[PDB]
Design an enzyme around this catalytic site. Sequence first.
Site, PDB file in Angstrom:
ATOM      1  NE  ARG B 146       0.126   0.728   4.584  1.00 52.62           N
ATOM      2  CZ  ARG B 146       0.421  -0.296   5.063  1.00 52.62           C
ATOM      3  NH1 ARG B 146       0.530  -1.395   5.719  1.00 52.62           N
ATOM      4  NH2 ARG B 146       1.568   0.836   6.460  1.00 52.62           N
ATOM      5  CG  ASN B 147       2.788   3.234   2.511  1.00 48.66           C
ATOM      6  OD1 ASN B 147       3.240   2.697   3.814  1.00 48.66           O
ATOM      7  ND2 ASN B 147       2.243   3.419   2.207  1.00 48.66           N
ATOM      8  CG  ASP B 160       2.614   7.058   3.346  1.00 47.57           C
ATOM      9  OD1 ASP B 160       3.217   8.181   4.407  1.00 47.57           O
ATOM     10  OD2 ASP B 160       2.333   6.467   4.248  1.00 47.57           O
TER      11      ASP B 160
HETATM   12  N1  LIG Z   1       2.440  10.283  -6.049  1.00 47.04           N
HETATM   13  C1  LIG Z   1       1.104   9.886  -6.034  1.00 47.04           C
HETATM   14  N2  LIG Z   1       0.110   9.303  -7.503  1.00 47.04           N
HETATM   15  C2  LIG Z   1      -0.545   8.866  -6.955  1.00 47.04           C
HETATM   16  N3  LIG Z   1      -1.526   8.393  -6.045  1.00 47.04           N
HETATM   17  C3  LIG Z   1      -0.555   8.473  -5.604  1.00 47.04           C
HETATM   18  C4  LIG Z   1       0.030   9.342  -4.714  1.00 47.04           C
HETATM   19  N4  LIG Z   1       0.587   9.653  -3.504  1.00 47.04           N
HETATM   20  C5  LIG Z   1      -0.187   9.052  -2.648  1.00 47.04           C
HETATM   21  N5  LIG Z   1      -1.212   8.355  -4.057  1.00 47.04           N
HETATM   22  C6  LIG Z   1      -2.285   7.814  -3.278  1.00 47.04           C
HETATM   23  O1  LIG Z   1      -2.737   8.113  -2.090  1.00 47.04           O
HETATM   24  C7  LIG Z   1      -2.618   6.980  -1.258  1.00 47.04           C
HETATM   25  C8  LIG Z   1      -2.274   7.032  -0.008  1.00 47.04           C
HETATM   26  O2  LIG Z   1      -1.044   7.896   0.048  1.00 47.04           O
HETATM   27  P1  LIG Z   1       0.116   7.818   2.011  1.00 47.04           P
HETATM   28  O3  LIG Z   1       0.666   6.711   1.398  1.00 47.04           O
HETATM   29  O4  LIG Z   1       1.279   9.092   1.011  1.00 47.04           O
HETATM   30  O5  LIG Z   1      -1.300   8.183   1.990  1.00 47.04           O
HETATM   31  P2  LIG Z   1      -0.783   9.120   3.295  1.00 47.04           P
HETATM   32  O6  LIG Z   1       0.354   9.405   4.134  1.00 47.04           O
HETATM   33  O7  LIG Z   1      -1.547  10.092   3.506  1.00 47.04           O
HETATM   34  C9  LIG Z   1      -1.991   8.249   4.889  1.00 47.04           C
HETATM   35  P3  LIG Z   1      -1.739   6.925   5.240  1.00 47.04           P
HETATM   36  O8  LIG Z   1      -0.283   6.712   6.557  1.00 47.04           O
HETATM   37  O9  LIG Z   1      -2.872   6.326   6.514  1.00 47.04           O
HETATM   38  O10 LIG Z   1      -1.424   6.403   4.525  1.00 47.04           O
HETATM   39  C10 LIG Z   1      -1.878   6.053  -1.697  1.00 47.04           C
HETATM   40  O11 LIG Z   1      -1.939   4.341  -1.897  1.00 47.04           O
HETATM   41  C11 LIG Z   1      -2.122   5.827  -3.230  1.00 47.04           C
HETATM   42  O12 LIG Z   1      -3.386   5.467  -3.925  1.00 47.04           O
HETATM   43 MG   LIG Z   2       1.083   8.029   5.811  1.00 48.99          MG
HETATM   44 MG   LIG Z   3       0.372   5.237   3.685  1.00 56.35          MG
END
Ligand SMILES: Nc1ncnc2c1ncn2[C@@H]1O[C@H](COP(=O)(O)OP(=O)(O)CP(=O)(O)O)[C@@H](O)[C@H]1O
Ligand SMILES: [Mg+2]
Ligand SMILES: [Mg+2]
Lengths: 284, 282
Positions: B146-147, B160
């Site tokens: 998921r990351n 992330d």
């Molecule tokens: N650069 C990117 N391009 C495309 N989709 C992206 C992206 N960055 C984030 N996403 C989408 O957003 C989702 C969440 O991203 P991220 O993992 O950075 O979340 P977050 O840090 O806001 C919260 P959490 O820690 O709860 O996941 C990813 O799984 C993806 O679906």
């Molecule tokens: Mg995060």
């Molecule tokens: Mg995440």
Amino acid sequence: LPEDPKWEFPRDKLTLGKPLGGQVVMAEAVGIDKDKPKEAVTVAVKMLKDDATEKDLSDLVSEMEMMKMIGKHKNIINLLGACTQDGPLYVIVGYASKGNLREYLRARRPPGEEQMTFKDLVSCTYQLARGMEYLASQKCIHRDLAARNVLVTENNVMKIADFGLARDINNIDYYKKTTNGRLPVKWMAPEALFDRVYTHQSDVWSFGVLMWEIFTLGGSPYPGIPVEELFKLLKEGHRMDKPANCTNELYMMMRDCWHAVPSQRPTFKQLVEDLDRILTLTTN
Amino acid sequence: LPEDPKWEFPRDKLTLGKPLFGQVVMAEAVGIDKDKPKEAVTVAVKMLKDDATEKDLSDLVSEMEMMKMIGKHKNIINLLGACTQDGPLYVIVGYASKGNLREYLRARRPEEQMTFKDLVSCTYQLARGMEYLASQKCIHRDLAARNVLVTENNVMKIADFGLARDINNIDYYKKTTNGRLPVKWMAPEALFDRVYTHQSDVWSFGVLMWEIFTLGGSPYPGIPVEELFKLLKEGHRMDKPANCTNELYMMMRDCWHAVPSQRPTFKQLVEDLDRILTLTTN
Ligand SMILES: Nc1ncnc2c1ncn2[C@@H]1O[C@H](COP(=O)(O)OP(=O)(O)CP(=O)(O)O)[C@@H](O)[C@H]1O
Ligand SMILES: [Mg+2]
Ligand SMILES: [Mg+2]
Ligand SMILES: Nc1ncnc2c1ncn2[C@@H]1O[C@H](COP(=O)(O)OP(=O)(O)CP(=O)(O)O)[C@@H](O)[C@H]1O
Ligand SMILES: [Mg+2]
Ligand SMILES: [Mg+2]
């Protein structure tokens, strides 16, 4: 975790169902109500998500324990039981058929569902003040008061919920840089971050924002204002504007809740009395 | 927030779009690519939610600072810029058109089916990214499908960095350390000893490998988080995935070796995966 019979509930008596809204789900609990030993009852169950962290677990436990100690009250979501042995922790609470207050109010906004009358709004605010007044009498600080954290029953009874951040008045580390770091900034009292303390008066500040959310029918606080710029604006005296259909009297109540000096804010008891008068006079 | 000219990007050149320590939205950045001053580039922007907490802000800040420090690599989502002055914090990163790895895989389940070689290739790229990350003295701490983001050309990109830290920036043995890492991807020592090393990350890589070969499966199926660590302490480990060779599964078990220093390094994983990929290809 320690066994606690008085609150334990049989896993085989609980049928988990559809998701609500870590992770909360609806479910049927057979005989959870000891006087109706065979009567199935619709309830809500809070449990951990599959990707839960250690802190998520300690928070769920804390929430359960806090609900056990708070006691029962009309305006506080009620703990019905819990499955804490040989399996995933399940915290069973009363089911509120109308969902959370934020969603509730937004769905009842003018067509511009049944609209909210001015009296319904004042009544909603009064019920919550009573709830908070009780909590404070039990030495409990909620710390996360907000429309999204209030549940509405079938008979429109308001229930303060989500005690995931709640604490006994003495279970707060005054002056530590890590204290209050997980409280939504827009509902948080200035001293919570600036001085690193938390008292019932910090809760009244939050109650003020809750009042604003109620009278804007579920609006978002400090619209257009980013959280990273908020505390600067608050130090400068900025305060949210009066909601459209809100009396100057109720607005001054919100303003009083946002006094920079905690002791200068009303106590929940005072809020209850004032709101009781307003509600009553509206009725007559 | 200290001004960092090198990374600052003008707000008037950024147009927030649909939704994707914060919340991510698509966006159009004009001239983000300094060699094409008037070109609009589709990007991703991470920012605070309206109900954000103080910790949510420091995490986003930390995420940004960690990405600046880490440097560039083909298998790591790249930082393009950041709006840090007079306004909400915006961390601008490359847009990955295929979403996160978990969603990407579950969609390709028996929507163009994944081949064994694709899966290995995917794994190999992630090892390469982690190898580089480890060489920069950075511990991700939140590695999982998921990351991982997948670009238009199916390039794997570790993302992330909301929990990432420098190897020396760990409050050793403190009971509050590592309290926010998803339990099912977490190395045993991270909780029992309150430490976190690159070898803790390789353990997570193992879980990631398992997600990959199960095409987005959920780890330790049927086992609640509350019961996992006692099992892990007893020696429980996930079974081999069907679309996985004994060799690759053995690699997973190595990453899950109870003893940290007995797990392979990312350097060794890359070498073995490369060899395996080269064979599967030739
Ligand atoms: N650069 C990117 N391009 C495309 N989709 C992206 C992206 N960055 C984030 N996403 C989408 O957003 C989702 C969440 O991203 P991220 O993992 O950075 O979340 P977050 O840090 O806001 C919260 P959490 O820690 O709860 O996941 C990813 O799984 C993806 O679906
Ligand atoms: Mg995060
Ligand atoms: Mg995440
Ligand atoms: N007893 C109940 N009856 C009906 N709906 C409920 C409920 N408990 C929770 N919900 C629904 O689930 C939502 C989330 O609940 P809760 O506020 O307890 O969240 P949570 O603690 O799991 C996560 P967060 O802290 O992010 O909100 C509520 O706003 C409401 O819509
Ligand atoms: Mg909540
Ligand atoms: Mg909560």
